[PDB]
Amino acid sequence: AAAAAAAAAAAAAAAAAAAAAAAAAAAAAAAAAAAAAAAAAAAAAAAAAAAAAAAAAAAAAAAAAAAAAAAAAAAAAAAAAAAAAAAAAAAAAAAAAAAAAAAAAAAAAAAAAAAAAAAAAAAAAAAAAAAAAAAAAAAAAAAAAAAAAAAA
Question: Counting beta carbons within 10 angstroms of the beta carbon of residue 143, is it exposed (0 to 12), middle (13 to 18) or buried (19 or more)?
Fold first, then answer.
């Protein structure tokens, strides 16, 4: 077994009607790739930042990273410059109510925040294709990146 997953004390909901989600892997290519030995740890977390890093139109852009330590592959969310941009790591993991549904939170400007959840599931020595998604309470930056991550 490898490392962390859904964690601790938060706030919840159970429903369908919601915002959309700007979504990363649109059609039939999802990221487990096993040769470089990282699947939903590194790039998934990483590139997700970019969306936020795009989210606020770049002003304070200095990128801090944070969090892993080198024994296998992981990295972390650390904020943009001088924003509230502190991004993925959160205590609150606002979790959809009925049980197995838990979506962690990529936080936002000095504000409320968005959330990013695995669409299928798989874990450590792991199985499914994962394709990732980020729930949508946020805005868009300048249409370009909105068109690389695919909306929905």
Answer: exposed
